[PDB]
Amino acid sequence: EVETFAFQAEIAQLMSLIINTFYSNKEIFLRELISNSSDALDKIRYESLTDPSKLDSGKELHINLIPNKQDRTLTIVDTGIGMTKADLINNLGTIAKSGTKAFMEALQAGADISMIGQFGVGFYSAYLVAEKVTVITKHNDDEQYAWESSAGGSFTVRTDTGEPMGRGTKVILHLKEDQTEYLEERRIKEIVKKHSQFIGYPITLFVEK
Ligand SMILES: O=c1cc(C(F)(F)F)[nH]n1-c1ccccc1
Q: Does 36 belong to an annotated binding site? A: yes
Instruction: Tell me the domain boundaries of the chain.
Output: 2-205
Instruction: Give me the helix-helix angle, 28-50 and 185-195, nearest 10°.
Output: 60
**93 CA distance to ligand 1 centroid (A)?**
7
From the number of C-beta atoms within 10 Å of its C-beta (0-12, 13-18, 19+), residue 158 rates as middle
Q: Tell me the C-alpha distance between 93 and 87, whole Å.
A: 5
Class of 2-205 per CATH?
Answer: alpha beta
**158 CA distance to ligand 1 centroid (A)?**
17
Pocket of ligand 1 (CB under 6 A): 33, 36-37, 39-40, 43, 78, 80-83, 92-93, 123, 135, 169, 171
Provide the 8-state DSSP code for 197. T
For the chain, breaks with the C atom over 2.5 A from the next N come after: none
**36 CA distance to ligand 1 centroid (A)?**
5
The side-by-side arrangement of strands in the sheet containing 73-78 is 2-6, 154-159, 145-149, 130-138, 168-175, 73-78, 63-68, 203-205
Kindly give, in sequence order, each residue whose CB lies less than 8 Å from that of residue 154, ignoring residues fewer than 6 positions away.
4, 5, 6, 7
Kindly state the helix (H) or strand (E) to which residue 95 belongs, with its residue range: none
- Mutation pick for ligand 1 pocket among 14, 46, 137, 167 (CB with most ligand atoms within 8 Å): 137
Instruction: Give me the helix-helix angle, 9-20 and 96-108, nearest 10°.
Output: 40
Q: Tell me the C-alpha distance between 196 and 188, whole Å.
A: 11
